[PDB]
Design a protein around this motif. Structure first.
Motif, mmCIF file in Angstrom:
data_model
loop_
_atom_site.group_PDB
_atom_site.id
_atom_site.type_symbol
_atom_site.label_atom_id
_atom_site.label_comp_id
_atom_site.label_asym_id
_atom_site.label_seq_id
_atom_site.Cartn_x
_atom_site.Cartn_y
_atom_site.Cartn_z
ATOM 1 N N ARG A 14 0.792 -1.242 0.000
ATOM 2 C CA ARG A 14 0.000 0.000 0.000
ATOM 3 C C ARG A 14 0.828 1.298 0.000
ATOM 4 O O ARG A 14 0.384 2.301 -0.565
ATOM 5 C CB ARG A 14 -0.975 -0.012 1.178
ATOM 6 N N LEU A 15 2.009 1.289 0.628
ATOM 7 C CA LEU A 15 2.939 2.430 0.556
ATOM 8 C C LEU A 15 3.493 2.590 -0.868
ATOM 9 O O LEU A 15 3.406 1.650 -1.667
ATOM 10 C CB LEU A 15 4.107 2.251 1.535
ATOM 11 N N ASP A 26 12.994 1.113 7.549
ATOM 12 C CA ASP A 26 12.188 1.579 8.686
ATOM 13 C C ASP A 26 11.280 0.473 9.236
ATOM 14 O O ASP A 26 11.097 0.367 10.447
ATOM 15 C CB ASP A 26 11.339 2.800 8.297
ATOM 16 N N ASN A 187 3.224 11.034 -11.338
ATOM 17 C CA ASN A 187 4.167 9.923 -11.140
ATOM 18 C C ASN A 187 3.442 8.601 -10.876
ATOM 19 O O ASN A 187 2.776 8.452 -9.849
ATOM 20 C CB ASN A 187 5.128 10.228 -9.985
ATOM 21 N N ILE B 10 8.564 5.893 12.962
ATOM 22 C CA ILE B 10 8.350 4.975 11.833
ATOM 23 C C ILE B 10 6.855 4.878 11.510
ATOM 24 O O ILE B 10 6.463 4.921 10.342
ATOM 25 C CB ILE B 10 8.918 3.564 12.135
ATOM 26 N N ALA B 11 6.040 4.734 12.556
ATOM 27 C CA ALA B 11 4.575 4.727 12.439
ATOM 28 C C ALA B 11 4.013 6.024 11.848
ATOM 29 O O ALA B 11 3.045 5.989 11.081
ATOM 30 C CB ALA B 11 3.944 4.467 13.799
ATOM 31 N N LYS B 13 5.481 8.265 9.702
ATOM 32 C CA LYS B 13 5.761 8.371 8.258
ATOM 33 C C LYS B 13 4.723 7.644 7.396
ATOM 34 O O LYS B 13 4.320 8.156 6.348
ATOM 35 C CB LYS B 13 7.164 7.839 7.928
ATOM 36 N N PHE B 14 4.301 6.459 7.840
ATOM 37 C CA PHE B 14 3.314 5.658 7.105
ATOM 38 C C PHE B 14 1.909 6.251 7.220
ATOM 39 O O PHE B 14 1.185 6.311 6.229
ATOM 40 C CB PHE B 14 3.293 4.198 7.589
ATOM 41 N N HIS B 17 1.662 9.632 5.250
ATOM 42 C CA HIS B 17 1.568 9.385 3.809
ATOM 43 C C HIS B 17 1.045 7.975 3.535
ATOM 44 O O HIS B 17 1.799 7.065 3.174
ATOM 45 C CB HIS B 17 2.918 9.626 3.120
ATOM 46 N N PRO B 19 -2.376 5.935 1.473
ATOM 47 C CA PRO B 19 -3.513 6.119 0.558
ATOM 48 C C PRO B 19 -4.862 6.148 1.313
ATOM 49 O O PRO B 19 -5.170 5.183 2.017
ATOM 50 C CB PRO B 19 -3.425 4.910 -0.387
ATOM 51 N N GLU B 22 -7.340 3.221 2.185
ATOM 52 C CA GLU B 22 -6.802 2.181 3.026
ATOM 53 C C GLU B 22 -5.967 2.781 4.171
ATOM 54 O O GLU B 22 -5.296 2.034 4.871
ATOM 55 C CB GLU B 22 -5.979 1.214 2.144
ATOM 56 N N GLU B 25 -7.190 1.609 7.319
ATOM 57 C CA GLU B 25 -6.584 0.270 7.324
ATOM 58 C C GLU B 25 -5.068 0.296 7.586
ATOM 59 O O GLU B 25 -4.567 -0.578 8.287
ATOM 60 C CB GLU B 25 -6.879 -0.502 6.023
ATOM 61 N N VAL B 30 -0.527 -0.670 11.108
ATOM 62 C CA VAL B 30 0.537 -0.221 12.024
ATOM 63 C C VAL B 30 0.245 -0.718 13.446
ATOM 64 O O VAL B 30 1.153 -1.177 14.141
ATOM 65 C CB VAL B 30 0.728 1.322 12.046
ATOM 66 N N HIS B 191 -5.326 4.492 -7.023
ATOM 67 C CA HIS B 191 -4.533 3.322 -6.628
ATOM 68 C C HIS B 191 -5.253 2.024 -6.985
ATOM 69 O O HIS B 191 -6.358 1.787 -6.511
ATOM 70 C CB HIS B 191 -4.255 3.359 -5.119
ATOM 71 N N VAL B 201 -0.427 9.401 -9.253
ATOM 72 C CA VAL B 201 -0.150 10.491 -8.312
ATOM 73 C C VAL B 201 0.065 11.742 -9.147
ATOM 74 O O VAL B 201 0.737 11.673 -10.169
ATOM 75 C CB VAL B 201 1.109 10.217 -7.463
#
Lengths: 270, 275, 370
Positions: A14-15, A26, A187, B10-11, B13-14, B17, B19, B22, B25, B30, B191, B201
Motif C-alpha cells: 500500500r505504501l 524503517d 508519477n 516509523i509509524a 511516516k506511514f 503518507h 492512501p 486504506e 486500514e 501499524v 490506486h 499520483v
C-alpha cells in the motif's frame, strides 16, 4: 508474529513502491525480529555492482550472492573475495556465460540502454536462472522513469526424450514520472507479477537457454501489454468518472436513453 | 532493540503518507504490527489531525444534512473546526468516523459574508463536475490579508474492486482592490491493487491574478478559472497518458524491437557483430 | 419530415445500404472507386470514368482500384462523397437524400475530425433532414436480441472488442487494433510472392482477397502445422492458370492472432477479447465471458472460432464457462441492428436534426453520440 509478517507485506503493498528501500529499512527498525523474513519476501529495486577486473556492471540478488559477497557473472569471482564460494559446475558455468551473452543481446534490442545480469545456480534435477535488467530513462527530460526485470526460471530436465519443464516467475517493477505539457506532473508506480510454466522438447540446434528466452520474450510482450492496460483501465475510468464535465449533460441523455432502451427492450423481444 | 521513540517516528511516516482508501486500514496495519496500542494510538492522534486536514475530507455532523471539509483554514486551534456554510463550530474526533457536539458561532463576517455568496455558487458547479462532491469555503484573516479559501474533494472507495480514486483541490482567493491574487494546488490520486499495484499520483500548482468587480461576477469568475483548469488538467491527465505514456513507457522499453520482428534466439547464439 | 430512414453501414472493405425495418440489406457492394488505367480509343466505350459497385466488379481489369478508407479512417474524402452519391443515385437506392433521415456507422475510438467532416458532407453537400452516427457493436447486439455481452468483430479495416451489459456500452473498456482483413490480404499477397506467384496490380489485388476468402484455414496448433509438411492444394484464377497455394494459406490468417508477423506492435484478436473483459468491473466479467458475439468477414476462416476458444482457455481464469456465439449472417449483423434501431419510435429523439446542426455545429453531434 505470522500476522505481523502478513501486515508487513500488506503495508509494503500500500505504501509507494518508489520508496521501498527507505520504508523496508524503517519497517525492519520497527520489527527487528522479522528482518530475515522481510529481506527474503519483500521485493525491492535491484542493486548496482561493479566488476573491477573486467570493468563492467553487474546486478545483485539473493540467489547469486553467497554470504557477504556476490559472484560477478563476467569474472566468476565474488567481491569481497571469498575463499571457497558456491560456484556452478564447469558445464553450467559455460552455459551461464552463453546465457549472459544471449540476454545481453536480448536487453540491448528491447531497451537500447541500461544494465543486465544473468546467474544460473546448479541443481541436481535442473538448472535455475535469474535474469536481472535495470534501464533508466532520459535524465535531462522532466519525465523520469525506469524499467526493472526479475525473471526467475526453473528448468526441470527430464531423463529420457530430451524434454524440459520450465517454470518462469516474472516480476516487473516500474515507476514512470511525467512532468510535461504545462498542465501538471504525474508519477505512476507499477508492480505486476505473472507466472508461466511449459514443457518443451530440447533441440540440438537451439540450447535450453533459448527455450527459456522464448518464455521471457513472450512473457514481456504480454506483461507489458497487461501492465499498459491496468494503467489506463484504472487511470481512465476512475479519474474521468470522478471529475467528468460531460457526465451531467450525458446523465440527462442517459435518462432519456433509459426510456429509449426500455422501449427497445420490449420491441427486441417482439 | 529499537527504542520506543523510534517506533512512533516509523509509524508516523506511514500514517502521514498513506492512501486514503486504506489509510484507516494502514493505521490498523501499524497497530496490528506493534503489540502495544497506547504508543501508536497517542502518536497517530497527532498524525491524524495533520493528515485529515491535507485530505480535505468532510466529516458529516449529525444534524446538518451536508458535508463540511476539514483543513488548516477551518482549524479554530482548540481541536474544533469551522463550518463556514452552516456557520456552526464542530469538534472532530480523529479515530472515530463522526464529529458531534457542535457549538453555534457568531462573527461580524464582513469579508466572510461576501465569499459565502461565491461559495454557495461554487457548490452548484462542484455538483456539475462530480457525481458526488463536497466542499468548504473558509473565511479567515491571514496576517492582515483578506482571503477566501474554497476547497473541493471527491472520495470513491470500494473494498471489493481494490481501486480507489481520490481528488483534492486547494484554492485561495485574496481580496485586494482592484487587482487580486490567487494561489492554488490541485492533487489527484488513484490506486489499483489487483494482481499487483498501479498508482496515479499528480498535482498542478496555479498562480493567477483576478480583478474584483461584483458579487455575481466574482462568484462566476473564480469558478470559471477552476472549471477550465480542472478540465484542462483532467483532459491532459486522461488524453496525454493514454497516448504519451504509451509512447514514453515505450521509449524506455519498446513493445517489439527496432526491427519490429520477434528476436530470433538461434540468431543470437550463432552470430557475430563489429569489426 | 419523418419518412422511412436509410441505414448506410460504413466499412473499409464493404458498404451496406437499404431501408429501415428490413430483414437483409438489399444494396451491398465493395467500398472502392475504380478508375480507368488504359486509354479509351474507341467511341462507344464505358462512359463516366469513375466506377463504383457492380460495374467496377464486372470491369476489374480496366480499372485501377483504390480504397478511400483504411482502418475505419477515410483518407480520400472526394471518393467517399462519390460513393455516398452512388448509394443515393438511381443505380442503387432510387431515392433523394432530402426525404429520408440517415443512420451512419463508424468504428469506435476514431479521430473526431473525420466524424465532423462526415457530418459536414451529410448536412451540406447532401441536404439530409437528420443524421445519427452509432457503434457497430451496439447494433449487432440489437440484431441478435441480447443486451449483455461482448462483441468481437473483424471487418477489412478494424478489429474491436466492445463489452456491453444491459444497455451500458462502456466507452473505456473498448479495445481496438489497426489490424484486420485488408492487412491479412496484404500479408497473403506477400506470402504468394515468397511462394512464386506475384500479384502487384490493383485489379489483381482483389484476386488475393478471393483466394483469402475461399482457400484459407486457421490451424489450432501452429507449431504442429509448421513441423509437418503441407499438401499444396490447388485453385483456379479468373484467367485459367492453376496455382499451388502451399503453406501460405494457413500462415496468412495467423496475422490476426500474432500481429508481429507483418511488423507492427499490437495485442491481437484473442488478446483484445480477453482485454475487453478484464478492463470491465469484476462482477460483470463472468456474464461477458458467457456472451461473446462474433461479427465481420474476417471471422469466417475455417477453425477461427475453435482457435479463439483455445486462446481464451489459455489466458482466462480456470473453471469459467466460455461461449463464443455467432449469427448465421455474420456479414450483415451490424446493418440488421441499424435497421431495427431505425424502425424504433425512440430513434427520433437520438438523432441530430439539420436545424440543431446549423445552430450549434459539431458540439451537438459530439454530445448526442455519447
Amino acid at each position: 508474529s505470522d500476522q505481523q509478517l502478513d501486515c508487513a507485506l500488506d503495508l509494503m503493498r500500500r505504501l509507494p513502491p518508489q520508496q521501498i528501500e527507505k520504508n523496508l529499512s524503517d519497517l525492519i527498525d520497527l520489527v527487528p525480529s522479522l528482518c530475515e523474513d522481510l529481506l527474503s519476501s519483500v521485493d525491492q529495486p535491484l542493486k548496482i555492482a561493479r566488476d573491477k577486473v573486467v570493468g563492467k556492471d553487474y546486478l545483485l540478488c539473493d540467489y547469486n550472492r553467497d554470504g557477504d559477497s556476490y559472484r560477478s557473472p563476467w569474472s566468476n569471482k565474488y567481491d569481497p573475495p571469498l575463499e571457497d564460494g558456491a560456484m556452478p559446475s564447469a558445464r553450467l558455468r559455460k552455459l551461464e556465460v552463453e546465457a549472459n551473452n544471449a540476454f545481453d543481446q536480448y536487453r540491448d534490442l528491447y531497451f537500447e540502454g541500461g544494465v543486465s545480469s544473468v546467474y544460473l545456480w546448479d541443481l541436481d534435477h535442473g538448472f535455475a536462472g535469474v535474469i536481472l535488467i535495470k534501464k533508466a530513462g532520459d535524465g535531462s527530460k522532466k519525465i523520469k522513469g525506469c524499467w526493472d526485470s526479475i525473471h526467475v526460471v526453473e528448468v526441470q530436465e527430464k531423463s529420457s526424450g530430451r524434454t524440459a519443464h520450465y517454470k518462469l516467475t516474472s516480476t516487473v517493477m516500474l515507476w514512470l514520472q511525467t512532468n510535461k505539457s504545462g498542465s501538471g506532473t504525474m508519477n505512476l508506480g507499477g508492480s505486476l507479477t505473472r507466472q508461466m510454466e511449459k514443457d518443451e522438447t530440447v533441440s540440438d540446434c537451439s540450447p535450453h537457454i533459448a527455450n527459456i528466452g522464448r518464455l521471457v520474450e513472450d512473457m514481456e510482450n504480454k506483461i507489458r501489454s497487461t501492465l499498459n492496460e491496468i494503467y489506463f483501465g484504472k487511470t481512465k475510468d476512475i479519474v474521468n468518472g470522478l471529475r467528468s464535465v460531460d457526465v451531467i449533460p450525458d446523465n440527462p441523455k442517459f435518462q432519456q436513453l433509459q426510456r429509449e432502451l426500455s422501449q427497445v427492450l420490449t420491441q427486441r423481444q417482439i | 532493540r529499537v527504542s520506543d521513540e523510534e517506533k512512533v517516528r516509523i509509524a508516523a511516516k506511514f500514517i502521514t503518507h498513506a492512501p486514503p482508501g486504506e489509510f484507516n486500514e494502514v493505521f490498523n496495519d501499524v497497530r496490528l504490527l506493534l503489540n502495544n496500542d497506547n504508543l501508536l494510538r497517542e502518536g497517530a492522534a497527532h498524525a491524524f489531525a495533520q493528515y485529515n486536514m491535507d485530505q480535505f475530507t468532510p466529516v458529516k455532523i449529525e444534524g446538518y444534512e451536508d458535508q463540511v471539509l476539514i483543513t488548516e483554514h477551518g482549524d479554530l486551534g482548540n481541536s474544533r473546526f469551522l463550518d463556514p456554510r452552516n456557520k456552526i463550530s464542530f469538534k472532530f474526533d480523529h479515530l472515530r468516523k463522526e464529529a458531534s457536539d457542535p457549538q453555534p458561532e457568531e462573527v461580524d463576517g464582513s469579508l466572510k459574508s461576501w465569499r459565502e455568496s461565491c461559495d454557495s455558487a461554487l457548490r452548484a458547479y462542484v455538483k456539475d463536475h462530480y457525481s458526488n462532491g463536497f466542499c468548504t469555503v473558509y473565511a479567515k484573516n491571514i496576517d492582515g490579508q483578506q482571503t477566501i479559501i474554497a476547497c473541493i474533494e471527491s472520495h470513491q472507495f470500494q473494498p471489493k474492486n481494490f481501486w480507489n480514486g481520490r481528488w483534492r483541490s486547494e484554492w485561495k482567493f485574496t481580496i485586494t482592490p482592484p487587482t487580486a491574487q490567487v494561489v492554488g494546488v490541485l492533487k489527484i490520486q488513484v490506486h489499483y491493487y489487483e494482481d499487483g499495484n498501479v498508482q496515479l499520483v499528480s498535482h498542478k500548482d496555479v498562480q493567477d491574478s483576478v480583478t474584483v468587480s461584483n458579487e455575481a461576477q466574482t462568484a462566476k469568475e473564480f469558478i470559471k478559472i477552476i472549471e477550465h483548469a480542472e478540465n484542462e488538467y483532467q483532459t491532459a491527465i486522461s488524453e496525454n497518458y493514454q497516448t504519451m505514456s504509451d509512447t514514453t513507457f515505450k521509449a524506455l522499453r519498446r513493445q517489439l524491437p527496432v526491427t519490429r520482428t520477434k528476436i530470433d534466439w538461434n540468431k543470437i547464439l550463432s552470430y557475430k557483430i563489429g569489426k | 419530415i419523418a419518412n422511412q430512414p436509410v441505414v448506410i453501414d460504413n466499412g473499409s472493405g464493404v458498404i451496406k445500404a437499404g431501408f429501415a425495418g428490413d430483414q437483409i440489406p438489399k444494396y451491398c457492394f465493395p467500398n472502392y472507386v475504380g478508375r480507368p488505367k488504359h486509354v479509351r480509343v474507341m467511341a462507344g466505350a464505358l462512359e463516366g470514368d469513375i466506377f463504383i459497385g457492380p460495374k467496377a466488379e464486372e470491369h476489374r481489369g480496366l480499372l485501377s482500384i483504390r480504397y478511400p478508407m483504411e482502418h475505419g479512417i477515410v483518407k480520400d474524402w472526394n471518393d467517399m462523397e462519390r460513393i455516398w452519391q452512388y448509394v443515393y443515385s438511381k443505380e442503387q437506392l432510387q431515392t433523394f437524400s432530402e426525404e429520408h433521415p440517415v443512420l451512419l456507422t463508424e468504428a469506435p475510438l476514431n479521430p473526431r475530425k473525420n466524424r465532423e467532416r462526415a457530418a459536414e458532407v451529410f448536412f451540406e453537400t447532401f441536404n439530409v433532414p437528420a443524421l445519427f452516427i452509432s457503434m457497430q457493436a451496439v447494433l449487432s447486439l440489437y440484431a441478435t436480441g441480447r443486451t449483455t455481452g461482448v462483441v468481437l468483430d473483424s471487418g477489412d479495416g478494424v478489429t474491436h472488442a466492445v463489452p456491453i451489459y444491459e444497455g451500458f456500452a462502456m466507452p473505456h473498456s473498448i479495445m481496438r487494433i489497426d489490424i484486420a482483413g485488408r492487412d491479412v490480404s496484404r500479408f497473403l499477397r506477400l506470402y504468394l510472392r515468397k511462394e512464386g506467384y506475384d500479384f502487384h496490380s490493383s485489379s489483381e489485388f482483389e484476386i488475393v482477397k478471393a483466394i483469402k476468402e475461399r482457400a484459407c484455414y486457421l490451424s489450432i496448433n501452429p507449431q504442429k502445422d509448421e513441423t509437418l509438411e503441407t499438401e499444396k492444394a490447388q485453385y483456379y484464377l479468373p484467367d485459367g492458370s492453376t496455382i499451388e497455394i502451399g503453406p501460405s494459406r494457413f500462415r496468412a490468417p495467423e496475422l490476426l492472432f500474432r500481429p508481429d508477423l507483418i511488423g507492427e506492435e499490437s495485442e491481437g484478436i484473442h488478446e483484445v477479447l480477453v482485454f475487453a473483459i478484464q478492463k470491465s468491473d469484476m462482477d460483470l466479467r463472468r456474464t461477458l465471458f458467457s456472451n461473446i458475439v462474433l461479427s465481420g468477414g474476417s471471422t469466417l476462416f475455417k477453425g477461427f472460432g475453435d482457435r479463439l476458444l483455445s486462446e481464451v482457455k489459455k489466458l482466462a481464469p480456470k473453471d469459467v464457462k466460455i461461449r463464443i456465439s455467432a449469427p448465421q449472417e455474420r456479414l450483415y449483423s451490424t446493418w440488421i441492428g441499424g435497421s431495427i434501431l431505425a424502425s424504433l419510435d425512440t430513434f427520433k429523439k437520438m438523432w441530430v436534426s439539420k436545424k440543431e446542426y446549423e445552430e450549434d455545429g459539431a458540439r451537438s453531434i459530439h454530445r448526442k453520440t455519447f
